[PDB]
Amino acid sequence: MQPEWSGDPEVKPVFLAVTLTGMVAFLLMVWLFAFYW
Amino acid sequence: LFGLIGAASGFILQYIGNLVDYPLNVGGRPLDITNWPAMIPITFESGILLASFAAAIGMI
Amino acid sequence: RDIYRVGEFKKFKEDPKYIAKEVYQEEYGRETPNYQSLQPGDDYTGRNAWGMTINLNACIGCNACVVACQAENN
Amino acid sequence: IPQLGQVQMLGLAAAVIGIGVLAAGYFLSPTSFFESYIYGYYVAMTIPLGCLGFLMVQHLTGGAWGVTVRRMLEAGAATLPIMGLLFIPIALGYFDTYKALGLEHPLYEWANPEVVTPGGAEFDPIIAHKVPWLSPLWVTARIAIFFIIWSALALTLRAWSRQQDAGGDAKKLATRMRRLSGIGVALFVITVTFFSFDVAMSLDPHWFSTIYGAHYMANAGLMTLAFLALMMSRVRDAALFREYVSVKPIHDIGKLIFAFTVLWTYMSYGQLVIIWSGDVAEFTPWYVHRTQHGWVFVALALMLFAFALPFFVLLFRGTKRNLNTLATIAGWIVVMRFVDMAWIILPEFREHLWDIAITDVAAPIGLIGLVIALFAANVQQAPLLPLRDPNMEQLQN
Amino acid sequence: EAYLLPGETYTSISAKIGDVPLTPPLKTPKGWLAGFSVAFFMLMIFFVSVTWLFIRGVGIWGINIPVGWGMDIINFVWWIGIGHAGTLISAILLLLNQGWRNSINRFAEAMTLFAVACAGLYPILHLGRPWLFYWLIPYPNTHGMWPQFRSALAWDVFAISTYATVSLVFWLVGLIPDFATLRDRAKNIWVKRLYGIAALGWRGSARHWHRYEMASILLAGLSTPLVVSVHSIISLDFAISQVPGWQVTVFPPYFVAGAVFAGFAMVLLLMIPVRTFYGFENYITLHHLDVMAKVMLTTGMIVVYGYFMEVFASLYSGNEFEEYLLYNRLFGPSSWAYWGLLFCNAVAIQPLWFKKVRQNIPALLIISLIVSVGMWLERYVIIVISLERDFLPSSWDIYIPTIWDWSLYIGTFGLFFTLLFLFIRVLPMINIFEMRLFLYQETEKAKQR
Numbered sequence A: 001m002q003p004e005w006s007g008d009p010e011v012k013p014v015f016l017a018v019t020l021t022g023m024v025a026f027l028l029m030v031w032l033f034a035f036y037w
Numbered sequence B: 001l002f003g004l005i006g007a008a009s010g011f012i013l014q015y016i017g018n019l020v021d022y023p024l025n026v027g028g029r030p031l032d033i034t035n036w037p038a039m040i041p042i043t044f045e046s047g048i049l050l051a052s053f054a055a056a057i058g059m060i
Numbered sequence C: 001r002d003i004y005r006v007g008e009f010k011k012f013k014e015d016p017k018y019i020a021k022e023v024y025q026e027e028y029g030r031e032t033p034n035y036q037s038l039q040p041g042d043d044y045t046g047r048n049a050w051g052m053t054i055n056l057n058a059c060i061g062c063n064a065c066v067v068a069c070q071a072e073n074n
Numbered sequence D: 001i002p003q004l005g006q007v008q009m010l011g012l013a014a015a016v017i018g019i020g021v022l023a024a025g026y027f028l029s030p031t032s033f034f035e036s037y038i039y040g041y042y043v044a045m046t047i048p049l050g051c052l053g054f055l056m057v058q059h060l061t062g063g064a065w066g067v068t069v070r071r072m073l074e075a076g077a078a079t080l081p082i083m084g085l086l087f088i089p090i091a092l093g094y095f096d097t098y099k100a101l102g103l104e105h106p107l108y109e110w111a112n113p114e115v116v117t118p119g120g121a122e123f124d125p126i127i128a129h130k131v132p133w134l135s136p137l138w139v140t141a142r143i144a145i146f147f148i149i150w151s152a153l154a155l156t157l158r159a160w161s162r163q164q165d166a167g168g169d170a171k172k173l174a175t176r177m178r179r180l181s182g183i184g185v186a187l188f189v190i191t192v193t194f195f196s197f198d199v200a201m202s203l204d205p206h207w208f209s210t211i212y213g214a215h216y217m218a219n220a221g222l223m224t225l226a227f228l229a230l231m232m233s234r235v236r237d238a239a240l241f242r243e244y245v246s247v248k249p250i251h252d253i254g255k256l257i258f259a260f261t262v263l264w265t266y267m268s269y270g271q272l273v274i275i276w277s278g279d280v281a282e283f284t285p286w287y288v289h290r291t292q293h294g295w296v297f298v299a300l301a302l303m304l305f306a307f308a309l310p311f312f313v314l315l316f317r318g319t320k321r322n323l324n325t326l327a328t329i330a331g332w333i334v335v336m337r338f339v340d341m342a343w344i345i346l347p348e349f350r351e352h353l354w355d356i357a358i359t360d361v362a363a364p365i366g367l368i369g370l371v372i373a374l375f376a377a378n379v380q381q382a383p384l385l386p387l388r389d390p391n392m393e394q395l396q397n
Numbered sequence E: 001e002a003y004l005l006p007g008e009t010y011t012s013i014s015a016k017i018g019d020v021p022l023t024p025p026l027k028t029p030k031g032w033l034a035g036f037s038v039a040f041f042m043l044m045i046f047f048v049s050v051t052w053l054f055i056r057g058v059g060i061w062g063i064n065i066p067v068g069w070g071m072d073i074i075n076f077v078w079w080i081g082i083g084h085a086g087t088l089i090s091a092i093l094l095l096l097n098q099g100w101r102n103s104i105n106r107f108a109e110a111m112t113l114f115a116v117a118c119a120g121l122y123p124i125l126h127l128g129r130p131w132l133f134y135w136l137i138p139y140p141n142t143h144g145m146w147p148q149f150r151s152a153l154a155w156d157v158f159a160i161s162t163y164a165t166v167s168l169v170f171w172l173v174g175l176i177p178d179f180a181t182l183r184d185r186a187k188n189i190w191v192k193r194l195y196g197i198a199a200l201g202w203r204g205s206a207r208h209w210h211r212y213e214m215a216s217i218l219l220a221g222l223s224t225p226l227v228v229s230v231h232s233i234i235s236l237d238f239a240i241s242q243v244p245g246w247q248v249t250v251f252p253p254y255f256v257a258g259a260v261f262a263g264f265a266m267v268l269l270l271m272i273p274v275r276t277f278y279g280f281e282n283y284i285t286l287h288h289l290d291v292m293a294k295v296m297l298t299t300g301m302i303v304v305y306g307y308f309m310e311v312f313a314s315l316y317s318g319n320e321f322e323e324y325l326l327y328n329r330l331f332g333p334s335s336w337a338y339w340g341l342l343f344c345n346a347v348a349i350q351p352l353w354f355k356k357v358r359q360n361i362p363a364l365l366i367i368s369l370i371v372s373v374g375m376w377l378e379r380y381v382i383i384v385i386s387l388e389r390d391f392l393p394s395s396w397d398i399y400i401p402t403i404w405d406w407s408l409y410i411g412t413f414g415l416f417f418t419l420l421f422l423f424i425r426v427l428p429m430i431n432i433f434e435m436r437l438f439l440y441q442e443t444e445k446a447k448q449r
């Protein structure tokens, strides 16, 4: 069974955006809790 | 996938926290992999939690 | 329960460990209790180790020590 | 049915070979034969006790799986009176039959007179404290009473099921069996727990575990469920197992095997964490004996092969739906149950992993072969899947 | 007996259950107002008790040096054990394909959520420095300190938090189809768009149901080990300790069986009034009450087996401490708890064996209330009596509860009932779907005879 959104231009872009958001959040959190002191 | 990730994350969290970052002798309990008892429950709970969130969010 | 151990002096002179050799014969049937532990502990072989010995024969129950702890540890 | 006869013949061959090597071991040393026999009886007893427990539980809770294996569970339960006769050699060991048959000392520590009598050469006080409860006459009477309760429940339930074929099955008989099963499940749990405590926990009187017996019931349940899956592959073609069966009963039995495997692991881990975390000298020795002289390797093998490998393999919808894959896992689980019980019973006597005798392997194979032969003899007495049953509609979904 | 009374239609199930919520505020029945007022008054008692606890400290209770754990832990265990029965109904019966879970899964699961909410306060309230609860949780701090992770209270933090989140997500997933029916029948533009956002445009259809059914089975499969693990961990803390009564190997399974037994009594006590007050007699039949009573009897027998195992352990061992534990339970200053325990959970369950007693609705209510009191007494016996007398005779003292811990107990009852009343006012008590699906399954069974 295909996903409902299969065959959409927006799928790769939304996945990318979610990954970029996540990476940014992770780096910022890491900096504050590990390197900011 | 997320259940296995959660179980591994819980185990690694306990190991790094209590046997590597701050090594603290508590009750004479071992500071090695022989401390695998008293490490199971957190692993199981983390695995179940992440598996449940994965199921619900993936369905949605 | 084995909280306080009391022994005669004449028997003590013949064997100092007689009080400890007894009790374990009544409880386990053997002079020495073979206690077994699943937990390793720490060596402590080459480092300062702090321990206290209290002599039951010497204590008179004055309670001076309790007052001393209260003054020292607030 | 020809496959059933082949299974019976294979079980008989395994039995005669196992008894024959056990007899050769007895000639060299009587003591080794008796210690091996106690382990062999304990592992063999699981298939009949498990069959009785599942039969009563399925009567209480109607299921498609329960209707499919009801006749096979009844046949396995029916072998319980013969199992009581097999207990007689163990009884001779702890009675005054010692000093004869070549036994230097009684099979059980409580049986030995010096240990339980004041002024005795050893006179261990803890074993002496339990002398009235742990005495040869009292132990035999309780085990015999348990056998009478087990035999009466198994024979009465089988007789009512055979009667169901003749008449009055719409509400009568089915309600009666359900009522006998409900009172029976409580009697079965109490009798099995005490039987496990007397036969195995009493080997070392110094140690006692409350969870023990419940763990044996889980171990018996896994062994019987694995045995049922192996038998079902052999009887997959039998005509009544052709127009009246579907993938759903096989899938349900696979789910039950997975639940029993996780349940057994939970009971074993629960005992280990409580004893390990509460480091009290009284309960520490049992774990110390099972983690020394190579026994640690057997414990690691149970943790990996017995628990992780089945849990991952049975985590898929396929490998439980498919009978052949369910059979291969079921044979592996049975081998792991034999290893688990050897780890539970053998360290009491061997003291070293390399000290295990051929008789230790011989006694379980010979006794379980007798059990299989009797089971295959009984199951051919009556047709499988009793057609006259108000639950036959669950098989037609 | 049947689990569904005949004469039901898909429209009738939508209209009957749908009518209870969505009724105009001014048309709320007076019984709801009375019950909500009582619950709110007990909630005010709860607020006063918590405020004075925070102002003065945990010293207002009856706890002392030997008994460091008093009625706070007893009530925590009681409330957390109430929530096992609903989780069982929601998950295990789904796995077991049992057909009596359809009409009672929603209310039982709501009871689980509210009981977990009530029981989650006690770990913070009893803490002595309640505002430092976050220290148990791993969190980035400048100190570099970590939780021990080898104690059982660290396990409690992970178990209760995981249990609450999984129960909430499973309950919300079940409500998503029900929200879709409510938004369609809301009849007010503002009432719609509130159920509609919660529904997330469910638009029930094939290729949505197929994923929904698989996800529900997977969530039910994950929850069954979770609930057993939660109660086993709430049993491990006593078991890990070297206290003689506390360290028992049978504690984990026995505690799980006790939780289902106590929870089923609470579910029977609350479900029977809801069934009679609304026209839910067709949805919840006498057969549902009879089967629930049989499950309660089955788990009660396991609790009695746990007692028998404990007594056999006391008589078996030669330790002076086990023998004195038995003596103090039987003839000690707190023997009343043990005698009431033996009366309430062993003698009361024996009538349940007879079919006539299970059929009678008054008999079930009386037995369920006795079981609820007996389970509280069991927790009291396990904790307080064991803590009162220990290895050293010089450190022996009696525990006498004050009025403030009782005030907290009634306050938690009030909070629980307030949450239940708001739930029944706003959301549907009975799953609207899985009840019409039950009707579909029953009609198909009739066709195949």
Ligand SMILES: CCCCCCCCCCCCCCC(=O)OC(COC(=O)CCCCCCCCCCCC(C)C)COC(=O)CCCCCCCCCCCC(C)C
Binding pocket: B001, B003, B004, B006, B007, B043, B044, B045, B046, B047, B048, B051, D255, D258, D259, D262, D263, D265, D266, D269, D311, D315, D316, D317, D318, E095, E217, E218, E221, E222, E224, E225, E226, E228, E229
């Ligand atoms: C001592 C620790 C004990 C650990 C207990 C482990 C067992 C609990 C497992 C959870 C249920 C998985 C069902 C999967 C599924 O839905 O299977 C379907 C078939 O569908 C499929 O093809 C595959 C589905 C994907 C499954 C992935 C699951 C994630 C991995 C697990 C991560 C675990 C955590 C801990 C890291 C059909 O199968 C079923 O649904 C049958 C369900 C049977 C319920 C089993 C109940 C467990 C009883 C033992 C529990 C013991 C206590 C101590 C926890």
Ligand SMILES: CCCCCCCCCCCCCCC(=O)OC[C@H](COP(=O)(O)OCCN)OC(=O)CCCCCCCCCCCCCC
Binding pocket: D057, D061, D062, D063, D064, D065, D214, D217, D251, D252, D253, D255, D256, D259, D263, D394, E088, E092, E095, E096, E097, E098, E099, E228, E253
């Ligand atoms: C409460 C906690 C622990 C639970 C442990 C048991 C594990 C339960 C989960 C596994 C489910 C297995 C798959 C489903 C199945 O095969 O059973 C369904 C069965 C038949 O249902 P139909 O398909 O025929 O539909 C009928 C209605 N339409 O339903 C049953 O009858 C239930 C089977 C019996 C359950 C056996 C568990 C007994 C628990 C023993 C506990 C021992 C404790 C020892 C200390």
Ligand SMILES: CCCCCCCCCCCCCCCC(=O)OC[C@H](COP(=O)(O)OCCN)OC(=O)CCCCCCCCCCCCC
Binding pocket: D049, D050, D053, D054, D057, D060, D061, D062, D185, D189, D217, D218, D220, D221, D222, E096, E098, E253, E256, E257, E260, E291, E294, E295, E298, E299, E302
């Ligand atoms: C090693 C061998 C195995 C031994 C196992 C021993 C332990 C077994 C315990 C089983 C307890 C069962 C209690 C009785 C429940 C009951 O009454 O059954 C009702 C149902 C529904 O069937 P219906 O409609 O009434 O009629 C069927 C015929 N048409 O069947 C069920 O089993 C589901 C009910 C819910 C199950 C409750 C038991 C859960 C036990 C949890 C505690 C476990 C402790 C570790």
Ligand code: SF4
Binding pocket: C058, C059, C060, C061, C062, C063, C064, C065, C066
């Ligand atoms: S100060 Fe007094 S009470 Fe304290 S140890 Fe010395 S003699 Fe005993």
